[PDB]
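Budget justification aside, the reviewers requested a transparent look at the raw inputs and outputs of the sequence design task funded under Objective 1. We therefore reproduce one unedited record. The lines immediately below are the structure tokens for a 289-residue chain.
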């Protein structure tokens, strides 16, 4: 919408912080009640400097414009006091990495047990992330940090992409050149070596996300140290085919993992394939935690 261009400002008295949400990796995030927005449950992210407030509104102006069925909904801001507030939709089931691990074979055994994530459910998660990435490419927006830890799960296995690497570093990040914290395990050779981030580097990251989904949230290249990870990526080595991954899906991953960016599969093509596989293997089983 044209109207989304403009940042929605919310009154402080219409926000009631209820409890903490996440650990968290995104700083202090709260579960809150939001009145006269249409009351609803929301997620609140907090931020206290002339330049930092300038970047806050810049970030708010970017987030307001990115609106899609598979992008975490940005509701607006509250700049009435300290700290500054960012309001997002509440995603009941939290981060996708935690969700994948909670529905893994180990979680089923070491458990009222949870249900093991099925191949049909994996494909359903995959097509939704691919849909959100198709939208970002259409808006000429480069995420730069696509990973399951940056995706959120809602009701009816609804999955949405978020964060976009804005602000925020765990073991999933490496200090590239001793200067910038970057997610090396999810990055192609050109992003590690030259810090070139494009729609094509996001395609590589989507391939790694597909590997994360099919391995129940395992860390990519888990057997390796950070230096070994960079060596494998730059040399042209690939992640192994997951046990539960069909050959068709692994070949899609290989298409994302082409060494040169111009050789990688197009985002529209990746989404169309995942959409067709998910439609042919639909979700119908009960999902327990
Ligand atoms: N259940 C549960 O843990 N939900 C949580 S945890 N963190 C959040 S917002 C977080 C940071 C703000 C940008 C949006 C965003 C986008 C992707 C990942 C995290 C975040 C929620 C929520 N939106 O529901």
């Amino acid at each position: 919408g044209a109207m989304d261009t403009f940042v929605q400002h919310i009154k402080r008295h219409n926000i009631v912080l209820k409890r903490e949400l996440g650990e968290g990796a995104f700083g202090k995030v709260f579960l809150a009640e939001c009145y006269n927005l249409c009351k609803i449950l929301v997620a609140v992210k907090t931020l206290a400097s002339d330049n930092a407030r300038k970047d806050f509104h810049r970030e708010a102006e970017l987030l307001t414009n990115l609106q899609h069925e598979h992008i975490v909904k940005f509701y607006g801001v509250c700049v009435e006091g300290d700290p500054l507030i960012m309001v997002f939709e509440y995603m009941k089931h939290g981060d996708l990495n935690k969700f994948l691990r909670a529905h893994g074979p180990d979680a089923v055994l070491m458990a009222n047990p949870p249900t093991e994530l099925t191949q049909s459910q994996m494909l359903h998660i995959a097509q939704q992330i691919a849909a959100g990435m198709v939208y970002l490419a259409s808006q000429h927006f480069v995420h730069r940090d696509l990973a399951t830890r940056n995706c959120l799960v809602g009701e009816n296995l609804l999955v949405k992409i978020g964060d976009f690497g804005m602000s925020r570093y765990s073991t999933d990040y490496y200090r590239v050149g001793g200067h910038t914290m970057l997610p090396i395990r999810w990055m192609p050779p050109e992003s590690i070596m030259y810090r070139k981030f494009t729609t094509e580097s996001d395609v590589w990251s989507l391939g790694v996300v597909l590997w994360e989904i099919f391995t129940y949230g395992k860390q990519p290249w888990y057997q390796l140290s950070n230096n070994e990870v960079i060596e494998c990526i730059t040399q042209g080595r690939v992640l192994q085919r997951p046990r539960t991954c069909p050959q068709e899906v692994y070949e899609l991953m290989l298409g994302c993992w082409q060494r040169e960016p111009h050789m990688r599969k197009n985002i529209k093509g990746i989404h169309t394939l995942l959409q067709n596989l998910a439609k042919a293997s639909p979700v119908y089983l009960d999902i327990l935690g």
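The first helix runs from residue 50 to 65. Residues 21-22, 26, 29, 43, 45, 72, 88, 90-92, 94-95, 150, 152, 162-163 surround LTI (CB under 6 Å). Computational costs for records of this kind are itemized in the attached budget.
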